[PDB]
C-alpha cells in the first residue's frame with residue numbers, strides 16, 4: 384500500500400460539507416480517523432452508485448457533491464494517494 388498505517392490512523396475533523404456526506408451513510412461523530420473517512424466515502428459511492436457498473440474501478444462523481452468536494456469529474460479508485468489528497472481538501476487534522 385502507498386498509504387502508511389500511521390496516516391490511516393490520523394485523527395481528522397471533516398469540514399461541514401464532507402461531514403454532511405459521512406452522516407448521510409450513518410456516521411455519528413465530528414472526529415474520525417482517515418480510515419473511517421475513507422470507508423464511509425466508499426459506502427457513499429456505493430449507495431449513490433457513482434461507480435461505473437461496467438468498469439467498477441472508475442468513479443464518475445460529476446453532478447454529485449463528491450465531485451465538487453474532490454474537484455474532479457471522475458477518478459480511478461486505484462489512485463490511492465490522489466484520493467487521500469482529495470480528501471485532505473475537505474478536513475482539518477486534529
Ligand SMILES: CC(C)(C)NC(=O)Cc1ccc(Cl)cc1-n1c(C2CCCCC2)nc(-c2nnn[nH]2)c1-c1ccc(F)c(Cl)c1
Pocket residue numbers: 386421422423424425426428429434439440460461462463464466467
Ligand atoms: C467497499 C468499501 C466501502 C470497503 N470500499 C472502500 O472503503 C474503498 C474506497 C473508499 C473510498 C474511495 Cl473514494 C474509493 C474506495 N475504493 C474503491 C471503491 C470502488 C467503487 C465502490 C466503492 C469503493 N475501490 C478501491 C480499490 N479497488 N482496488 N484498489 N482500490 C478503493 C480504495 C481502496 C483503498 C484505498 F486506500 C483507497 Cl484510497 C481506495
